[PDB]
Amino acid sequence: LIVTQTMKGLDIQKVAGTWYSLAMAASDISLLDAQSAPLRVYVEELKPTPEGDLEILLQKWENGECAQKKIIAEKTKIPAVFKIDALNENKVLVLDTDYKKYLLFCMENSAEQSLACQCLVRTPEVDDEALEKFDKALKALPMHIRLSFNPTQLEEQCHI
Protein backbone atom coordinates (compact mmCIF):
# COMPACT_ATOMS: atom_id res chain seq x y z
CA LEU A 1 0.00 0.00 0.00
CA ILE A 2 1.81 3.05 -1.29
CA VAL A 3 -1.47 4.45 -2.63
CA THR A 4 -3.58 5.71 0.25
CA GLN A 5 -6.00 7.63 -1.93
CA THR A 6 -9.24 5.86 -2.73
CA MET A 7 -12.64 7.11 -3.82
CA LYS A 8 -15.20 6.89 -0.99
CA GLY A 9 -18.76 6.13 -2.11
CA LEU A 10 -17.68 4.79 -5.53
CA ASP A 11 -20.32 3.28 -7.83
CA ILE A 12 -18.53 1.50 -10.69
CA GLN A 13 -21.74 1.34 -12.74
CA LYS A 14 -21.34 5.05 -13.41
CA VAL A 15 -17.73 4.74 -14.70
CA ALA A 16 -19.30 2.99 -17.74
CA GLY A 17 -18.40 4.12 -21.24
CA THR A 18 -15.64 5.99 -23.08
CA TRP A 19 -12.39 7.28 -21.48
CA TYR A 20 -9.24 9.04 -22.70
CA SER A 21 -5.88 8.52 -20.98
CA LEU A 22 -5.03 12.25 -20.87
CA ALA A 23 -1.99 11.82 -18.58
CA MET A 24 0.07 9.05 -17.04
CA ALA A 25 2.76 8.67 -14.38
CA ALA A 26 4.93 5.86 -13.01
CA SER A 27 7.49 5.15 -10.24
CA ASP A 28 10.16 3.94 -12.70
CA ILE A 29 11.10 5.62 -16.00
CA SER A 30 11.22 2.25 -17.83
CA LEU A 31 7.51 1.54 -17.04
CA LEU A 32 6.43 4.34 -19.44
CA ASP A 33 9.38 5.56 -21.51
CA ALA A 34 8.65 3.71 -24.79
CA GLN A 35 5.57 2.85 -26.88
CA SER A 36 6.12 -0.78 -25.85
CA ALA A 37 6.88 -0.08 -22.17
CA PRO A 38 4.84 -2.48 -19.93
CA LEU A 39 2.49 0.13 -18.38
CA ARG A 40 2.00 2.36 -21.41
CA VAL A 41 -1.63 1.32 -21.83
CA TYR A 42 -4.23 3.66 -23.23
CA VAL A 43 -7.74 3.15 -21.92
CA GLU A 44 -10.50 2.91 -24.51
CA GLU A 45 -13.64 1.77 -22.62
CA LEU A 46 -14.75 0.64 -19.14
CA LYS A 47 -17.27 -2.21 -18.80
CA PRO A 48 -18.60 -2.91 -15.28
CA THR A 49 -20.21 -6.38 -15.23
CA PRO A 50 -23.58 -6.93 -13.40
CA GLU A 51 -21.65 -8.82 -10.69
CA GLY A 52 -19.56 -5.64 -10.17
CA ASP A 53 -16.29 -6.74 -11.79
CA LEU A 54 -14.61 -4.33 -14.27
CA GLU A 55 -13.64 -5.29 -17.79
CA ILE A 56 -11.24 -2.89 -19.41
CA LEU A 57 -10.78 -2.27 -23.11
CA LEU A 58 -7.36 -0.82 -23.90
CA GLN A 59 -4.68 -0.22 -26.56
CA LYS A 60 -1.07 -1.32 -26.06
CA TRP A 61 1.85 -1.19 -28.52
CA GLU A 62 3.29 -4.69 -28.44
CA ASN A 63 5.04 -5.99 -31.57
CA GLY A 64 5.19 -2.75 -33.58
CA GLU A 65 1.39 -2.83 -33.86
CA CYS A 66 -1.15 -1.06 -31.72
CA ALA A 67 -3.07 -4.05 -30.27
CA GLN A 68 -6.52 -4.28 -28.64
CA LYS A 69 -6.49 -5.91 -25.21
CA LYS A 70 -9.26 -6.96 -22.85
CA ILE A 71 -8.50 -7.03 -19.14
CA ILE A 72 -10.83 -8.28 -16.40
CA ALA A 73 -10.36 -6.57 -13.03
CA GLU A 74 -12.01 -8.54 -10.26
CA LYS A 75 -13.82 -6.65 -7.47
CA THR A 76 -12.66 -6.93 -3.82
CA LYS A 77 -14.41 -6.17 -0.49
CA ILE A 78 -13.19 -2.58 -0.99
CA PRO A 79 -15.42 -0.99 -3.62
CA ALA A 80 -12.54 1.26 -4.89
CA VAL A 81 -10.05 -1.61 -5.34
CA PHE A 82 -9.91 -4.33 -8.00
CA LYS A 83 -7.53 -7.22 -8.80
CA ILE A 84 -5.95 -8.33 -12.11
CA ASP A 85 -4.42 -11.77 -12.80
CA ALA A 86 -0.62 -11.80 -13.06
CA LEU A 87 2.38 -13.51 -11.37
CA ASN A 88 2.28 -10.83 -8.67
CA GLU A 89 -1.46 -10.12 -9.05
CA ASN A 90 -1.69 -6.40 -9.72
CA LYS A 91 -4.05 -4.05 -7.88
CA VAL A 92 -6.17 -1.39 -9.51
CA LEU A 93 -7.41 1.47 -7.27
CA VAL A 94 -9.86 4.26 -8.16
CA LEU A 95 -8.65 7.39 -6.36
CA ASP A 96 -11.32 9.91 -7.48
CA THR A 97 -13.99 10.36 -10.15
CA ASP A 98 -16.86 12.73 -10.91
CA TYR A 99 -18.18 10.12 -13.36
CA LYS A 100 -19.08 12.84 -15.88
CA LYS A 101 -15.67 14.43 -16.71
CA TYR A 102 -12.62 12.75 -15.07
CA LEU A 103 -11.42 9.53 -13.37
CA LEU A 104 -8.06 9.04 -11.54
CA PHE A 105 -6.71 5.56 -10.96
CA CYS A 106 -3.48 3.77 -10.15
CA MET A 107 -2.14 0.32 -10.74
CA GLU A 108 0.30 -1.17 -8.23
CA ASN A 109 2.27 -4.26 -7.47
CA SER A 110 1.46 -6.27 -4.32
CA ALA A 111 5.17 -6.54 -3.54
CA GLU A 112 7.71 -4.26 -5.28
CA GLN A 113 6.86 -0.17 -5.15
CA SER A 114 6.03 -0.47 -8.82
CA LEU A 115 3.22 1.98 -9.54
CA ALA A 116 1.55 3.85 -12.43
CA CYS A 117 -1.34 6.27 -12.35
CA GLN A 118 -3.54 7.87 -15.01
CA CYS A 119 -5.80 10.84 -15.40
CA LEU A 120 -8.70 9.71 -17.56
CA VAL A 121 -11.20 12.10 -19.13
CA ARG A 122 -14.43 11.50 -21.12
CA THR A 123 -13.56 13.66 -24.16
CA PRO A 124 -10.43 14.50 -26.25
CA GLU A 125 -9.81 17.71 -24.30
CA VAL A 126 -7.09 19.13 -22.01
CA ASP A 127 -9.08 19.37 -18.77
CA ASP A 128 -6.91 21.70 -16.59
CA GLU A 129 -8.95 21.02 -13.45
CA ALA A 130 -8.65 17.23 -13.64
CA LEU A 131 -4.88 17.54 -14.30
CA GLU A 132 -4.66 19.67 -11.11
CA LYS A 133 -6.37 16.84 -9.21
CA PHE A 134 -3.96 14.35 -10.82
CA ASP A 135 -0.94 16.50 -9.86
CA LYS A 136 -2.20 16.80 -6.30
CA ALA A 137 -2.69 13.04 -6.16
CA LEU A 138 0.86 12.64 -7.50
CA LYS A 139 2.75 14.78 -4.89
CA ALA A 140 2.08 12.02 -2.30
CA LEU A 141 3.60 9.38 -4.63
CA PRO A 142 7.22 8.67 -5.67
CA MET A 143 6.75 9.21 -9.44
CA HIS A 144 9.81 9.59 -11.73
CA ILE A 145 8.06 9.75 -15.13
CA ARG A 146 4.99 11.75 -16.25
CA LEU A 147 3.37 12.00 -19.65
CA SER A 148 0.54 13.99 -21.04
CA PHE A 149 -1.15 13.97 -24.50
CA ASN A 150 -2.67 16.73 -26.71
CA PRO A 151 -6.26 16.46 -28.29
CA THR A 152 -4.84 15.34 -31.69
CA GLN A 153 -2.94 12.39 -30.13
CA LEU A 154 -5.98 11.54 -27.95
CA GLU A 155 -7.91 10.69 -31.16
CA GLU A 156 -5.26 8.30 -32.52
CA GLN A 157 -4.80 4.67 -31.69
CA CYS A 158 -1.90 4.27 -29.25
CA HIS A 159 -1.84 8.16 -29.09
CA ILE A 160 0.37 8.34 -32.19
Ligand X SMILES: CCCCCCCCCCCC[N+](C)(C)C
Which residues contribute to the site for a copy of itself (CB under 8 A)? 29, 33-34, 143-150
The entry of a copy of itself, ligand X, none that residue 157 binds, CB within 5 to 8 Å by partner kind: none
Name the one range near ligand X by CB under 6 A: 21-29, 38-46, 127-135, 138-146: 38-46
Of the residues 71, 131, 147, 158, which one makes contact with ligand X according to CB under 6 A: 71
The entry of ligand X, a copy of itself, none that residue 105 binds, CB within 5 to 8 Å by partner kind: ligand X
* Residues found in the chain: 160
Helix (H, G, I), strand (E, B) or coil at 42: strand
Reference 56, options 78, 82, 25; nearest CA is 82
- Strand pairing category for 81-84 and 90-97: antiparallel
Cβ closest to ligand X, residue 107 vs residue 127:
107
* CB of residue 1 to ligand X, shortest distance in Å: 18
d(CA 120, CA 86): 23
* CB of residue 26 to a copy of itself, shortest distance in Å: 11
d(CA 103, CA 6): 11
Cβ closest to ligand X, residue 84 vs residue 131:
84
Name the one range near ligand X by CB under 6 A: 28-36, 87-95, 122-130, 135-143: 87-95
Contact between 40 and 58 (Cβ < 8 Å): no
DSSP track, 111-134: ----EEEEEEESSSS--HHHHHHH
